[PDB]
Amino acid sequence: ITGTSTVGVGRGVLGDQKNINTTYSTYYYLQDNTRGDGIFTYDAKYRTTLPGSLWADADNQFFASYDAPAVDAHYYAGVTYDYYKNVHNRLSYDGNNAAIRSSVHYSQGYNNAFWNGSEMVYGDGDGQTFIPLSGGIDVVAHELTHAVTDYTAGLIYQNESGAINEAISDIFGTLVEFYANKNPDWEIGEDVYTPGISGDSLRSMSDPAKYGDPDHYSKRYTGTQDNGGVHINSGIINKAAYLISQGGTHYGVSVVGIGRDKLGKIFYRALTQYLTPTSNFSQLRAAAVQSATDLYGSTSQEVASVKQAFDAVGVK
Ligand SMILES: [Ca+2]
Ligand SMILES: [Ca+2]
Ligand SMILES: [Ca+2]
Ligand SMILES: [Ca+2]
Ligand SMILES: [Zn+2]
């Protein structure tokens, strides 16, 4: 839409009030012109046809319960854009300020969110397992990071390369959550998962085995479900990333933590410079060691901690 940039106000899925960037042209649209070529949020109207209609509002106030998933999809896409720009010098997911598009109210009772190769898509959940999935900033940043991966390393979505793909999205989803300082943790999806149960989440990076995911390469899933375990074996890499950042002793191997900022720098360099579509876990280790070497030197603590973390999860 062509029109005038303005700022509206609304309430997100968790009931918090926030300001959002909109565009005025007869209606107020969820179109943010302040970031790249724009952030656009669409209403899929409980259907599966995409993208749906660009979100239009009569008064620039978004306090209806129907509005909430749109507010959060729109706002958290902006935060994720800001993260990649300010921290990694990356302009949107393609590096050239591509427009970011999201559709909310996808289908009925849909307990998931995804990047479809062109846009982000959020279900509303069924009210029991999930509430609308854009309510989690780690979820939004997880999905948008799939777009970054698609335009850089291109990791194919199966077997070890796919598990790496998933882990990269969990890792940067978590780093974005820390960047926004929104009650940050090392869990995935806790804000929108099981509204009736407190303290849980979909996945854990600190302790993947909490929810039955492997935390060591010896426990990797080798069958054919879930595209060869892409959401399962990501736990091995998530645990390694958690160890690099926070440290700890895991299966008797001790890791000195180097912090979240350096973890992000190492993995972003690995992703954008060294990983390829068919990279496996052992090539990820090599890429991460080389990235830390590039950034901090071959005799640094940083290189040593990357090596120890991968040793700890059994990835040689
Ligand atoms: Ca309104
Ligand atoms: Ca959190
Ligand atoms: Ca989280
Ligand atoms: Ca819960
Ligand atoms: Zn994913």
Side-chain angles (χ1 to χ4, degrees), residues 150-225:
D150 279 3
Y151 277 84
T152 57
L155 293 153
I156 74 111
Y157 207 66
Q158 84 206 357
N159 301 330
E160 284 189 12
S161 49
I164 296 163
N165 189 321
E166 270 298 307
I168 294 292
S169 279
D170 284 344
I171 291 164
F172 284 101
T174 289
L175 293 179
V176 174
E177 190 174 293
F178 271 97
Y179 170 85
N181 234 331
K182 311 236 180 274
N183 265 109
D185 52 51
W186 292 91
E187 309 281 296
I188 302 303
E190 68 283 348
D191 289 342
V192 297
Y193 188 63
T194 60
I197 307 168
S198 288
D200 64 337
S201 59
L202 216 60
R203 289 184 289 280
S204 175
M205 300 182 69
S206 62
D207 184 17
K210 204 187 181 226
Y211 305 113
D213 296 324
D215 60 1
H216 195 274
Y217 191 70
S218 74
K219 304 190 173 185
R220 70 190 184 286
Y221 172 74
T222 57
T224 60
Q225 232 65 44

Side-chain angles (χ1 to χ4, degrees), residues 265-271 273-274 286-296:
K265 287 293 165 82
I266 291 163
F267 268 78
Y268 181 81
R269 185 171 182 88
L271 184 66
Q273 276 283 125
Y274 294 118
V289 166
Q290 185 62 60
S291 300
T293 297
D294 297 346
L295 291 170
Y296 308 107

